[PDB]
Paper text:
For all structures, 10 mM cysteamine was used as the agonist since this is a saturating concentration of the most potent, known agonist of ELIC. Likewise, the agonist-bound structures were identical in both lipid conditions, deviating insignificantly from apo and propylamine-bound structures in POPC nanodiscs previously reported. Importantly, the agonist-bound structures showed a non-conducting pore with occlusion at 16’ (F247) and 9’ (L240). Thus, structures of WT ELIC in poorly activating POPC compared to activating 2:1:1 lipids exhibited no meaningful structural differences. Of the six structures obtained in this study, three others show evidence of phospholipid density at this outer leaflet site, including WT apo structures in POPC and 2:1:1, and the WT agonist-bound structure in 2:1:1. Thus, among agonist-bound structures, phospholipid density at this site was not observed in POPC nanodiscs. However, the structures of ELIC in POPC and 2:1:1 nanodiscs from the present study show no differences that point to coupled and uncoupled conformations.
Residue numbers in the entry:
A (entry chain D), B (entry chain C), C (entry chain B), D (entry chain A), E (entry chain E): 11 to 317
Write the structure that this text describes.
Amino acid sequence: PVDVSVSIFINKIYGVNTLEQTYKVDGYIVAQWTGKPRKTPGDKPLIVENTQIERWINNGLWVPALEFINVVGSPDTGNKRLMLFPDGRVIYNARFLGSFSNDMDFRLFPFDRQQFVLELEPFSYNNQQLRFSDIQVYTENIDNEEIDEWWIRGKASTHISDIRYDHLSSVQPNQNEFSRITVRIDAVRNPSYYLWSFILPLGLIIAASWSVFWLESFSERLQTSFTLMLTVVAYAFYTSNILPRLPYTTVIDQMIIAGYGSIFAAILLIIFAHHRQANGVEDDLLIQRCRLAFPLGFLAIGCVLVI
Amino acid sequence: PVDVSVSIFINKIYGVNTLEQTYKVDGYIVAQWTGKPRKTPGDKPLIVENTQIERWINNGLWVPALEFINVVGSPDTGNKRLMLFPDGRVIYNARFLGSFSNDMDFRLFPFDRQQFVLELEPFSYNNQQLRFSDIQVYTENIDNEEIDEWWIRGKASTHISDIRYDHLSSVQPNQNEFSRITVRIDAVRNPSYYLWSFILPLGLIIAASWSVFWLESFSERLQTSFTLMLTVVAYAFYTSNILPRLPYTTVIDQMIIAGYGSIFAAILLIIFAHHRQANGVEDDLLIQRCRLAFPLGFLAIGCVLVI
Amino acid sequence: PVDVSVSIFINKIYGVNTLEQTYKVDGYIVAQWTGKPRKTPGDKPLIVENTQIERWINNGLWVPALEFINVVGSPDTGNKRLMLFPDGRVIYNARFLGSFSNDMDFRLFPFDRQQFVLELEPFSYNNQQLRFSDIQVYTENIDNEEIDEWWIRGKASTHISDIRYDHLSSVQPNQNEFSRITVRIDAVRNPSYYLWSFILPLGLIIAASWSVFWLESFSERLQTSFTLMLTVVAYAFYTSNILPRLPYTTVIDQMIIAGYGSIFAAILLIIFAHHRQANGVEDDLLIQRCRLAFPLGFLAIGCVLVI
Amino acid sequence: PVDVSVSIFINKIYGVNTLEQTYKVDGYIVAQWTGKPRKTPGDKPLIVENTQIERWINNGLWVPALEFINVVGSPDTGNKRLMLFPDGRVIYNARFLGSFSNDMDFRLFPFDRQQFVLELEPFSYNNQQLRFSDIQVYTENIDNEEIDEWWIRGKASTHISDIRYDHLSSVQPNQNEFSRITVRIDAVRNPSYYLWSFILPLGLIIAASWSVFWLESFSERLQTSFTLMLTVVAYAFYTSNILPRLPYTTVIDQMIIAGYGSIFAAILLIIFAHHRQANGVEDDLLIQRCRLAFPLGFLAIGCVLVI
Amino acid sequence: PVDVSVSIFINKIYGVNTLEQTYKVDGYIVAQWTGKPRKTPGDKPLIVENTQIERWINNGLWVPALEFINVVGSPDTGNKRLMLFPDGRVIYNARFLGSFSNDMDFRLFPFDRQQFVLELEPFSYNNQQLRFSDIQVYTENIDNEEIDEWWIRGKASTHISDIRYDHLSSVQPNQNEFSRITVRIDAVRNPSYYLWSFILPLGLIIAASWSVFWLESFSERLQTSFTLMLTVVAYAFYTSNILPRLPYTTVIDQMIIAGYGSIFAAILLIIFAHHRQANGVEDDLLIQRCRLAFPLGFLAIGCVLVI
């Protein structure tokens, strides 16, 4: 089994899609393995550029075809080169630009924390023909930087494992385990834009929804509740183009639900305090004292939403 | 007729478009067939990588060109390899990433159930020159998982059939039937986002539309109905970017129609109860008792919409 | 002149853009022509796959380069093959997936009827070197089916013509007429979505705009007219992302104009009935009897819009 | 210097983007130049198709590489051919489909007039090695036609010039002037859609904004002004997706500014006529006579905007 | 070390994305270096076009592979050529069209100033095998021009540096420093569109929000505040599609926050002046004199936002 020594240089991370859970990684990759000695012009190494590599593969040079597992679409390679040494070791350098994917959990959406993963694997050689001896990742350009609204925290984590495929078992009996290199990069979301853009106006709308009971006329109370309903609908659209259709509920979706519930409970209590009459002569003040109750109750609901 | 033994490994399913009825499938495909024996260096098999395959096809190796029938655009192949054995059998492995299409029925749209189909076929060899002997599908990565808002239920279904083309009948008389492999994967839509995002606010808007008759002044009644009309129009736009232009009506479109009908019937009954006078002196209470009738009637309409 | 016999199999039609007047057609194309006899291994035909065709064109095989005239961007060919016979006839089969365009007339937009056109032509051989003898179109998959909101009606129409180019006249004097194959497929738009989505709410808004004159207070009348103006503006945006910027007026644009005119005429008549005073003491009822006139007049306008 | 005789056939113009100032041109291009005589099979010309051209360029045939200067992205060539004559002249025909750009001036935006420009140039040969002798443009398909909302007026204008590059001056001293072919096609915008879609409702909104002073109650006057402000904001969004972010002001942006100024001046005059009191007892009619003044003044502003 | 002399001609800059912080640069690049003498047909130089370059690289010609470092996706090369001299010097000319990226600071967003950067680097040769001797940039087409809403100010700045990579240190010990060419182009944003489109209506909305206290009835005061809240929400959406999700706050986002705070403070003071009673009989004028205070206070807040 040939011992390949991979080394990855993450040049930049960008294009982080939350609706699609993809991200674009641009970088270089250097593989290195020892073969048999050869005769090079002079005694220096020999550099072979892009379209001259297959002229060497045709004459019997063994270059493995590494691939990225978690990629979305075939990656965009740029330049590539071989470096052949008279000592015998071959070095394959190549520039990649790929669109990768990972499982993201958005249950704390503005105050989020995910990781960007790169999974590299030989396409056709098992660990009985090719194994990765080590892996070195050089995130110098993204070490502690604010790429988008994403804080990259610390040094990347590397791992080498063996993955078994139940397909190819009829092709290679018991020699169907492949080496795999995994690179993980932790990232923390910067929640500031969602604070001054989504949390503050929705909180003020819920406060102004509590502030309906300080009116008098039944008609103004209902029309006020309906204008506030229209504002909540506008903010319900405006939060839909930042986050996918998740089965659970985030903070902002819970605030939209809280605004809807505030308006509906205010309408219900207003209609009830208008209809709770003897015949038509009664006026209610035992139930219009929720100027302090509804802030207390909905503060308790927000607190139990925090826990 | 050469007996080809295909084996498909679905790596991931993503990008499920409802507006376009497409979905992206990424995976591998392994074909395998026996030919004539050969001389391989040593006695092991011989692995031939991407650009070295056509150097073998030029020297007379028979590799068939399988294709995907239901694809949208030419698929994106990545790496590929041949494995030639001294026994005589050839194995062709290739990675595909395609954008497939299928006929979807959205008549129960949030509570939906579709299937993802892969149709594979030889491009140029009929069943008198090439037939598929078996098909094995390995959906281990998507066996019971929540890819998007889509539950993949159970193991995939495979089938092998013979399709006849009336074109090529002037080219090949009666030898114009092709083998075809079909793979079906059942998927169930997770309706939670449409519950807490579309059903609940539209239901509350219809309830608040019933709640107009508890006012008095004709003017406040009509202006209230018009603000509710504006809210229904906002939710009519907001449901248009989740679902295509279907000739039938889903649950959410029926709720939009129900909100429009609620507002229109309230306006009509309000104007009628304002104009049903002797000359100008009458006031009506025999028709303002629909505080209980309109919930009953529109509940009956919703119930008959359920059945 | 070589007599080429083309045969087209329309596999599917999709992606019909109304804003761009394009549509995507996926299918196969089979050309066939007789040459000189040859020696084939055995006595069967000989099938030549994708990258092996140019190895035969280099050795002097005459394969013409047909093209699609009305395409938008270079088409996406997939697989292709030659079938060479010892009798002498060559058959060229190829799979195409193209984005075609056609002149559409949207003057009856929801109740529309267009046709999808495919124009095929030799790129470099006039009708003195290559002519199309016949054309057969096999629309079995789209014979009477609802692809989108588009009904495909009946069998396709084929035609063979000769087109003259005034460029290349300095290149080929009087031998500059090319054969051309035209395929037309009639399609009828399914108007249901535009009925229950655009016609019904706009009609109800125009009815509710007529229903303003049943109020009293000048202020409520004007504020009601302005809320209805806001609703008409919302529906004016909501109809703009279904149809391009046409110089003429469709049904839905005429309904938007009718809603604007209804609101403006109501505002004008309301202000006039408020100002038509002696000094400040008069009230008008000779002009507030348009509760029946405005439905009659605007019904007459809608009727003359029908004719 | 070889005298090349270019001839361009504009097949269609489409995809005219105003936000990006690009347009897609699809057509053919025929270059023609005389070389040295040769031996052709028979005595006719010899047609060489797409992938057989480089087999002739490898054996020493001189084909120049013309390019399009003002293109956005590398153009999409389709088929191409050579026509070699025993007389000695070579003709190079090729189909192009490109996305070109030009400087557009939108200062009269609905009543606009631009031109579509094609700039062709040799990539590597100066006017001392290659010069264009003439240029013929055949716009028969777009001679007087309504492609989109764009009238193509008359025959195209052609020009041949010499462009000097200060780069390549260290490469070629004083032989760094290149021939250039320019084609200009005048186009006039059809303003009808912007008339019945943007000018008419904004004018009616400004008229209804003048119509606020015919009310009484200070509160209804301010709430009416605010509903009209909301309608102007809706039309301010609705005009933003038709035109880029220009530093100057078009007609529709000036109408939006006029609506804002109408609402603001009405609010200011209403508040002033409410506060211009003795202590709290005065009512003003010397300033509420702007029912005729504000149409006159804002008509004067619109007139001076015309000039 | 070979001394390469690069020369860049910026043909155009366009496609400036603020949401993605990319920009498209189209231009040419000329490298030049001296080698060993050769025999050219005649005594002139020898021009080698696109697909004939690799026929010379196969026979042992040394052409380096320069690359662009800060590019997003692999660049789009068009034509390219070699110019070989009998003196010995080789000139490599190529046309590039790339989508580059740079770190932009939007803290003064309408009154902005950024720079467009091009970073070029050899892919495989260190400064011990290849170094850049000089760099000349010819921005004649964009010298002082208004490409979009971006003023290009003056001549470009060039720099040549040496970059060290800690990856490839196990590959090349201490010979792992690469030459790098950097080109910077200063650009100033034209703030006019944001002045007459975003600053003026938001300022008028804040003024009209101050103008609420000149009313009387508690109900009209609250409904007026809520209509103004709805207008602020509309302008809060309308400013979101011009600028990314930045952690800091620009001028327009601060104006949106100021409008929200104006409405909330007005609602709070109105409710307080309605509830600051003895029991129910008091009316407050000591706190309704903020007709002059709120302009003063919020003018002070805007002034401290300026500093």
